[PDB]
Structure 1
Amino acid sequence: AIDFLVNILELIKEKQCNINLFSAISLTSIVYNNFGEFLSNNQSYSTNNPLLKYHIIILNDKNKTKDVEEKRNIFKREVAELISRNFKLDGEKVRNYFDSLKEVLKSLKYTIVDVEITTRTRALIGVSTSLGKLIFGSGISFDPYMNLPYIPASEIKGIVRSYIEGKLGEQEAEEIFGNEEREGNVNFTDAYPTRSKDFLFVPDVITPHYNGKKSEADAEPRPVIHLTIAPKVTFRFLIYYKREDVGKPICDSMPIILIRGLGARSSVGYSLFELRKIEVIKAA
């Protein structure tokens, strides 16, 4: 129903962190992409939907079209700010999830390594994944059932393996992470945020001027509002394995590989992390 739509920003700001952020942003994108139509006397006539504020303000009169376009740019920035301030992190469900998962693994006689890492710079994990993609163009790796951003276990394993084969050759890697003829000896869970300082998401911009341009005569900034993971957000994941060998290469690999990137745009210092804590539970 359209009434679910024209009242979805109110929902984001009142149900904060208890709403399904994936579906919320997905439905918000319909308003965002039909802005000119949702403003033509279809604000639901409420008083706490941000949508009639764009009827008080006047940005242009010589063009209704330009009016709508500038209002829509403002509205994109405001959606970014809404998500970032309202959708905070409550990481109690994740702490319970990981404690129970670790108990399960202790039953299955694995040796668990529970690693806690902290974001140091606005991170970008899953920048091509769909979340805010239909508004911002970028995205975040978002688990719509934990209702959180997460770091895929495949990504962490790929980075750890890239490093281990960097400094131990392309054969001890396959001895640890297997190949097309052996299964790996090391398992990785996804990483979920367990505790932030203030925010979980954060608006940001990127404004290419010259990327893919010939000269100065075709240069033009195109600014790309998007969402990133705030600093000081702490993720945790598990690492479990049955042989005692692979404990050695992963331990020392953990502190090293994190200070260099763990997501996107590491080259310009974005997804820089910080080993907060590591801990090894041996089974037998």
Structure 2
Amino acid sequence: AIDFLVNILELIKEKQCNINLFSAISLTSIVYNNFGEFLSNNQSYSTNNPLLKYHIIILNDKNKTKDVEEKRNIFKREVAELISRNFKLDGEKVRNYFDSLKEVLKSLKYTIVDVEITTRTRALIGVSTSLGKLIFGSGISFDPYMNLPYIPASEIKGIVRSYIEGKLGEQEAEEIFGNEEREGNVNFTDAYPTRSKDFLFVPDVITPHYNGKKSEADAEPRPVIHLTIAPKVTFRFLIYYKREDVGKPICDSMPIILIRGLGARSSVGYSLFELRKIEVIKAA
């Protein structure tokens, strides 16, 4: 129904941790991409939608097309700030999930290594994923059932494995993580955010001027508003294994791999983390 559309922003503003952010962003992308038409007296004639402010504001009296373009850029920035402010973190479901999972794995006689890691700068994980991809052009690796961004276990294991290669040779790398003729001795889980000081997502921008440009006559900025993960957001994840002599490298690698990036565009200091905690719970 068009009513869910015209009320999705009120919904975001009023539920804020209990909407499905994935579907919410995907449905407000329809509003974003039909802006010029949702404004032609299709405000639902209510006074709660954030769309009503774009009927008062006059940005270009002379041409209504440029007018709507500017209003739409304002709307994009406004949506990013809306998601950032309203959608915040409750890590209680995540703490319950990880604790129950630790119990399950202890039953299965695994050697568990609970790891928490606080993001030091604004992070960017899964920037080519699909969350906002239809509004911002960027994404965030995001669980639509935990309703929370996360770090894929494949990605953590990949960074750890490349570090162990660089440090100990691909032979021992494969000896820990397996090759196409063996299997990995160490298992990883996704990393979900358990606690944050404040805002979960925060807006940012990138503005390529001379990327893909021949000369200074090509130069024109192209701003890209997008959402990133706020700093001081803690991500918990586990590592479990059976083979005991797999503990040494892993718990040795973890403190270091975090200093360097753990996400996207870390060559400009974005996705840096800090080892907040480790708990090895050996199987006896």
Assess same fold via TM > 0.5.
yes
1:22 aligned to 2:22? yes
Mapped partners of 1:45, 1:114: distance in 2: 52
1:94 Cα deviation after fit: 0.1
1:93 Cα deviation after fit: 0.1
Deviation string, structure 1 residues 122-174 (Cα, Å, up to 9, x no partner)? 00000000000000000000000000000000000000000000000010000
**What is the SS of the residue equivalent to 2:121?**
coil
Deviation string, structure 1 residues 6-60 (Cα, Å, up to 9, x no partner)? 0000000001111000000000000000000000000001111100100000000
Mapped partners of 2:35, 2:263: distance in 1: 33
Deviation string, structure 1 residues 79-98 (Cα, Å, up to 9, x no partner)? 00000000000010000000
1:104 Cα deviation after fit: 0.1
Mapped partners of 2:256, 2:143: distance in 1: 27
Instruction: Quote the residue 1:40 is aligned against.
Output: 40
Structure 2: any 5+ residue segments left out of the alignment?
none
Mapped partners of 2:145, 2:49: distance in 1: 26
Mapped partners of 1:266, 1:29: distance in 2: 28
1:230 Cα deviation after fit: 0.2
**What is the SS of the residue equivalent to 1:138?**
coil
Mapped partners of 1:143, 1:48: distance in 2: 29
Instruction: Quote the residue 1:86 is aligned against.
Output: 86
Q: How does 1:1-284 map to 2 (within 5 A)?
A: 1-284=1-284
**What is the SS of the residue equivalent to 1:129?**
coil
Deviation string, structure 1 residues 191-213 (Cα, Å, up to 9, x no partner)? 00000001100000000000010
Deviation string, structure 1 residues 204-235 (Cα, Å, up to 9, x no partner)? 00000000100000100000000000000000
Mapped partners of 2:16, 2:134: distance in 1: 21
Mapped partners of 1:45, 1:201: distance in 2: 31
Structure 1: any 5+ residue segments left out of the alignment?
none
**What is the SS of the residue equivalent to 2:224?**
coil
Mapped partners of 1:277, 1:121: distance in 2: 18
1:62 Cα deviation after fit: 1.2
**What is the SS of the residue equivalent to 2:239?**
strand
- TM-score under structure 1 normalisation? 1.00
Mapped partners of 1:244, 1:95: distance in 2: 26
Mapped partners of 1:43, 1:54: distance in 2: 10
Mapped partners of 2:42, 2:269: distance in 1: 43
**What is the SS of the residue equivalent to 1:55?**
helix
Mapped partners of 2:148, 2:232: distance in 1: 16
Mapped partners of 2:75, 2:166: distance in 1: 46
**What is the SS of the residue equivalent to 1:259?**
coil
Mapped partners of 1:230, 1:45: distance in 2: 36
1:115 Cα deviation after fit: 0.2
Q: Percent identity?
A: 100
1:258 Cα deviation after fit: 0.2
Q: Calculate the aligned-residue CA RMSD, in Å.
A: 0.4
- TM-score under structure 2 normalisation? 1.00
